[PDB]
Every structure is written in C-alpha cells, then in structure tokens.
From a paper:
The 12-kDa FK506-binding protein ([name]) is a ubiquitously expressed peptidyl-prolyl isomerase with considerable homology between fungal pathogens and is thus a prime candidate for future targeting efforts to generate a panfungal strategy. [name] proteins all catalyze the cis/trans isomerization of peptide bonds N terminal to proline residues in polypeptide chains. In addition to its role as a [name], [name] is a member of the immunophilin family and is the target of the immunosuppressive drugs FK506 and rapamycin. Three extended loops, which have been called the 40s loop (between β2 and β3), the 50s loop (between β3′ and α1), and the 80s loop (between β4 and β5), surround a deep active-site pocket that binds both FK506 and rapamycin.
Sequence alignments revealed that A. fumigatus [name] contains the same proline residue in its 80s loop that makes intermolecular interactions in the C. albicans protein. Thus, to deduce if A. fumigatus [name] might form a similar self-substrate-like interaction, we crystallized and determined the structure of the apo form of the protein. Remarkably, we observed the same insertion of the 80s loop of each subunit into the active site of the other subunit. Interestingly, unlike the C. albicans apo [name] structures, which were all captured with Pro104 in the cis conformation, in the A. fumigatus structure, Pro90 in one subunit was bound in the cis conformation and Pro90 in the other was bound in the trans state, thus potentially providing a snapshot of self-catalysis. While every structure of the WT apo A. fumigatus and C. albicans [name] revealed the same interproline interaction, even under very diverse crystallization conditions, it remained possible that these were all crystallization artifacts.
Numbering used by the authors:
A (entry chain A): 1 to 111
B (entry chain B): -2 to 112
Amino acid sequence: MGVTKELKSPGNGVDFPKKGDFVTIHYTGRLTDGSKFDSSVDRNEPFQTQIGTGRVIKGWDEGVPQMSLGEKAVLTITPDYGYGARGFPPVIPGNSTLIFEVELLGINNKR
Amino acid sequence: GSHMGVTKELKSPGNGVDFPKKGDFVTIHYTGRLTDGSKFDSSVDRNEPFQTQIGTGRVIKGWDEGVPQMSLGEKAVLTITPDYGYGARGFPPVIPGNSTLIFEVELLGINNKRA
C-alpha cells in the first residue's frame, strides 16, 4: 500500500518494534530521481523516536515495526504515507515518493 | 529548541528596489543547515538555482514570508521554525529530529529580472 518494506540484511528475526517502543535507526532518504534529501548516517548521529504513536510519517510508523533488530531494509513510501501533496519545498517537493535506506540499531534497551 | 517563526539576517544588500511580490516566479540559490551547522540541502551543490513561485504556498510558510522581504541580489539567512504541520513542534519532523531549519538564501532573479 502506502509503504512497502524490502529486506536487505536480516536481523535477529525475534525482536520487533511494538507500539510505544523507542526505536533507534540510521537512515538515508532519496527522491525517485535518486537524489538524497536527508541522512543521519552522514551526520554520524542515529535517530531515536517512539514508533507506535504517530510521531513520524506513517511510512515509518508502519514500515519500521516490520523490521527486526539489526535489520537493513528499504522503505518505499508514497506521498500519502509521506509528506503528502504539500510536501516541504524546497526540502521535499510536493507529491514526492520517498525511498529510505533504514537500519534498525535499537529497540528500547536491546541494541 | 527555542526558536519560533522566522528570523531574517541581512548578509549582503540587493539593489534595494526590486522585491518579490505575490505570484512572482523567483530564482534562488540556497543552502539548508541545522542549528549545529550541518548541511542537509543545497542548490549550490547541485549547480542549479532553485526556481519557484512566491507567496502562493508552493514553498513553506517561512519562505513565503522571508523571500518577499529581500531585494534583487540580496544575500540573507532565514532561521525558520514552522508554526503548523510537518516539521513543527508536536508534528512529525521533516528533518528528524529538528523543528528549526536555517536557510542561506541568495535572491538571484525576480521573473525575468536578474541580479
């Protein structure tokens, strides 16, 4: 639907993020033309957030819990599950499909 | 995480006569940075100016407010914290995890008028 997850590197296949859990990921976002618009990897600063509570775009809220701990995957997100038709120009153009590289580094106190 | 709205720093003056009005198509070279100084976006690095209509909501609120305050050829820095929607406090972030974004802006053109 609005977001598809495609695995790249498997995790422990046991620990999955649940609602309320605080998740720690390293990511890179790209538009459909292949150009990068944001990356935590470039800053060497992993991003931390609660995941079941709509604190991020739906693409992350739905996609991330489908990953296991230590998994690397690519989240392909429609504008609907993303920043919509408005977007956030010039940072993110309107009606943009987002392709994230995502690495789940931690779930609560797991790592 | 203190800032609110838009703060405009004047770096270098333009011609001081030609300001973008509502509906004008504007040419801009910009660099986006975080509060710590990290660069996350740049039209300069793409060697191609960002072109958009101004004052019609085709860019974020902070830009529609800040850009018409510049004259043709002006260099300025826009410290922007969205009041509503994506990127604002209480909303899902555009650049996780921030709300205040800083834009170095050079007004290169107003319609067919070039600096």
